[PDB]
């Protein structure tokens, strides 16, 4: 069919629409509840063998809105590619023990504070300057998809860390993905997405991709079909946004996605940083448009620094076939699967 | 079939292979020739109506290698998105009278100096504070695809500017595109590309896309077919690089594209900058992988600031259907067309 | 005396040493106490006339540690210059309703979340896309100046906002400045500093400088005298760090400051951004060394956009005498005063 | 007298004025002259012992304008801090065989091309994939200190490379420093500066500072005295710019420096990059104001990666006394000396 047929996993995206509904304001905030953190389990659990990497997800049913926390206890070297125009971010350290992704827009950054505080307690409040427990956080604005103003707070972040376990990730509406949505040319056509992950082991090489797509654009599959977002209930069709944009221009102008890619392959800070950018850009294949002024698109690239690539890039497949760029490209397909899991 | 069928123009990419051949090192440089600039006409000439924007292209047969210059006499606000890990850039100004694209790797930045010197002469050497004739230059490494070390020098850049005429662009092997090539997992599979352009007018809105793709990755069409690069002569097939990278890791790890988008729509510095990133990332659809450490990918987004978008984004197609993001997305498809013309 | 003599106001910095004491990187944390927020009054109250700008400061005696909040109810355009190698920053928005400075290293970023939560309550929980109350926060590591692990939390941040009043700032050991210290070539020579603010009105032009210096380097006055940090109790002398570093290299290699500048002068994003960098770099005069890999130096430049500079920069003092650069240089002196107040 | 007295070398700055005169445009350019390169010898030759680092400097009398080239044949890891708001840069590579500093504003970037083209010819046009000879260039606008439009062209950059010799730097009016000038609140008070260099060896540690100050601000010595720039011929006094700016505002608003630091101490890309920023910011001590919107301030930090620093930072002078921050501070003083040599 197309060039990527033989690496497509045939994810079974549900053709059924799930419009997010109209923007209804006046909803109750955090101070209207004795909020109870709930462990997020999603529609399905992904389980994977990546020692040292744990994941927790929690949500409030009041929202619904949640946080998803990637816990790497030992700490890991990190590059951040904040490429969107509306990025809400905390820390953005080049070394992290946890990455916290959350709804609630800028207010949801508080969840990450809950994680860092909890990690300090777990360190029993040791305060060496080279002993900081570092947490980077990113947020999506999910207030449009729901009639409540509840936001992931300190307690929910702490809960998410507490609910963290090795090698598991809740697919679908869970954690930060509870009220994520796509396709925002018009809110009438916006669909709920969710969060998604995917994992691959290549020999000893491990790659985990985590994504919470709350795009202005729509989610598309490797066949080039729009599978989530911009659904018109009148036509039953999901058109690529560019057709609405085209027509909007003819009429009126007459003459956020937060993600993480985690691997165990050793990369220098410059390799890791470019790796981050490559994989982030590859996501404009599965999300369109992407990296727009409206989006706060932020990808974290994390390495546990456990295995080395060969000193020379050579193989029987080519002289330049085993390096970071080859990895970022294998990783790009894992991330696309993760995006399709979120949109499934 | 796929979501972008209705905006695809059916560019007829030639199935016929054009491998670059193997790397032959030790050829003669500029010193070995009395180099005479040839005006580039390419396989075909695109003509477009965009007042104030001219293009010139020149090459040395002795390379073969060349330079392509976008000349906007009145000067135009510019944003630069230098994403790759191997960028060769000069100037990078937020306002430019010319953009110079050339082969010859870093040495070919000299062609842009030839343009700036020539423009200074034209201004009769005026050097007042606000009178700079600003030129931004970017290069590709095109020495692989030939057995000569001749690079675009000061003279060639000057020639390219002199050959510059309104509303024309030579498609294919012309200017900077004379020895551009794609698909470099192994040089045996590498194919010659070329340079390409496309133009679209929407009412008064104008969008020109110029591209010189010399990717590590390959060129792909909207159907998802690899149409240029990584051609295996033994199989007659162009596989997606990921399959080569995949097998290479199994075996060995057991357990540049320079482009410009030029429009006449008024955008603030922030909008133009984000517009550049969006359009640049969108190119990872037509080129894969893209923005890699091996690539010096650089896109210039240029506006002549001649027409306004409405103060509100609304239209019958949605409340957020007329803005810079909408424009960047219409522009993304013009650029894909340009990439296909280069790989045609 | 020196070029700046006529601009200096003879701030009376106390000659008396106040070494922080040997660091015990640890101690009782926030859970060991029932933390009671204390409105900070420091050693002295600075009173200024800048309508629209309020300041609150709070601390926990149990640290001691604290948070200082600048609250601009109407919101103001902001530029962030995060220059150090160990920055702890949340938000970093280009438009803020509050800036939150705090101790507690990264953990202290929680205080800023307390402010943003409060502000969302005050807005009775409206979450309109353009209704966000935005808060940017930065932190200093002040665990080395105390035998405690208490850090500014959500509650302390909220208190600081609550204690915020127009035109008042608590000089000295107050808010974020409670346990700030300077001069860390060795902790045995490290002195407590504090927080400081200065204010100047030029006609209608207003300039407020707020600073919390916790440098690796030392504070120095306009005469070039080290007046806080790197105090050697044996000699009674504060040497410039460079002499220690110099000696250290002969022997062993044989052959954070967070600040804000708030003004009412209209500046474009580009101008405000460059204004921020200029003022920030000017602080390497009063703090040496500065912008080091060990520091997380961050300056916020905030404008209430109320008065215009003339369209041309001319005056009797010169053709380039009235512009943003002129302002950033008037502002640089205000900020140096604030630094000296902090070290007083 | 002041904290730095003991590190000051008592550079004998000439008190005599050397006003640049006013900007007068319309003068003849390169086409009016049969330009021949002159090896710049300046007022005085600095000799230094730094194997592997050469310096060439050439100028055209007809400008007078020139280029200064730092040649490191073996190539060296580089970080670039381009702070200013009016930067003119070519290449900016993280690995360089030469750094080219020149007058002639953006047009002067052409001199760098002359270097690169000459290096290619030396390599005999070996275009090996990784045999690139990389040259990074920066420029100052010196067209305001002379009545000509002559700019450093390809031939002059070549000449500066060809005149390059080990361990020699021509102080004063030489190379890029021919028509550099300082203090530009008004052109009538602007003074010619020059270029400067200083060198220090600590054991086997070697630090070379090169600077071409063409500041909007004025050069100041360690005592805080204005020594070059803003000289009023009527008063015989050089005031600090802030006094002119301060008076300008009352009246009208009623109610580039390019430089390089070269060392042989091994630093990681992240260390080298922050080292660059620290040293660059330190220069606001000797140049005031600095890093302004009107300046294109660019500093290159280059390491030959020859000596290691200890694995721990400890010494008798303190726990944190031997590291890249310590080196960047030792380097800061070498750079200040070079600034004073330029203004001498
Ligand atoms: Na001539």
Short mmCIF file of C-alpha atoms in Angstrom, two decimals, chain C residues 65-68 101-111 138-143 146 150-153 156 175-179 212 258:
data_model
loop_
_atom_site.label_atom_id
_atom_site.label_comp_id
_atom_site.label_asym_id
_atom_site.label_seq_id
_atom_site.Cartn_x
_atom_site.Cartn_y
_atom_site.Cartn_z
CA UNK C 65 12.91 30.60 54.12
CA UNK C 66 10.33 32.55 52.16
CA UNK C 67 8.72 33.80 48.98
CA UNK C 68 8.39 37.26 47.44
CA UNK C 101 10.56 34.52 43.75
CA UNK C 102 11.32 31.89 46.40
CA UNK C 103 13.89 29.84 48.26
CA UNK C 104 13.78 26.07 48.56
CA UNK C 105 15.45 25.37 45.21
CA UNK C 106 13.18 23.60 42.72
CA UNK C 107 10.79 22.53 45.49
CA UNK C 108 10.09 26.23 46.05
CA UNK C 109 8.50 26.51 42.61
CA UNK C 110 5.45 25.23 44.48
CA UNK C 111 4.93 28.69 45.98
CA UNK C 138 12.05 31.33 39.86
CA UNK C 139 13.99 29.96 42.82
CA UNK C 140 17.25 30.04 44.72
CA UNK C 141 18.94 27.16 46.53
CA UNK C 142 18.99 28.30 50.17
CA UNK C 143 19.40 24.94 51.93
CA UNK C 146 20.37 26.62 57.29
CA UNK C 150 11.62 23.45 55.01
CA UNK C 151 10.81 24.99 51.64
CA UNK C 152 8.30 27.59 50.40
CA UNK C 153 5.15 25.62 49.65
CA UNK C 156 3.46 30.25 51.66
CA UNK C 175 10.58 36.70 51.65
CA UNK C 176 12.80 34.92 49.14
CA UNK C 177 15.72 36.75 50.69
CA UNK C 178 15.48 35.19 54.15
CA UNK C 179 18.36 32.75 53.66
CA UNK C 212 17.30 38.20 45.46
CA UNK C 258 16.75 36.06 40.64
#
